Amino acid sequence: LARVDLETTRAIAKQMFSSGTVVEVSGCWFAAKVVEPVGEDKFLVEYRDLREKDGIEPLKEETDFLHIRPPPPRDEDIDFAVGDKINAFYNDGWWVGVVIDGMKHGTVGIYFRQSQEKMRFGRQGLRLHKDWVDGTWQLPL
């Protein structure tokens, strides 16, 4: 968050994230939809996958402008390589991680620093990591 500009980031969130806007909300990114902007900096969002305790009602939460972003653009022809920063769809969310072993029988070996564990993920649940920075998509530094 030395990459982003607070002022720009706030303005751009206020521009793009209207009611009904499909977004991701923050280590891990969860699919969600804007319910309504709140204040000048916050957004009430409804999670696509996360649920309240009953496992039925969608979880709703307030998030700030620094924890929301558009869905990233997709790539289908992804050539995963060792060292690549990726997201893995894990526990209803896209977890940041690293490729530690290339593709084998449709799966990729993944490591998560956040929980210090490694496992394989199917290629359906994998994407290259991308940073939303001042209204643009940037690849990792």
φ, ψ for residue 16, nearest 5 deg: -90, -25
Residue with tokens 């982003």: 4
- Helix or strand or coil: residue 83? coil
How far is the C-alpha of 48 from the C-alpha of 27, rounded, in Å? 18
Do 100 and 87 touch, CB atoms closer than 8 A?
A: no
Identify the CA nearest to 92 among candidates 70, 59, 117.
59
- Fold exhibited by the domain 6-69: SH3 type barrels. (2.30.30)
How far is the C-alpha of 20 from the C-alpha of 35, rounded, in Å? 6
User: What single-letter DSSP state applies at residue 114?
Assistant: T
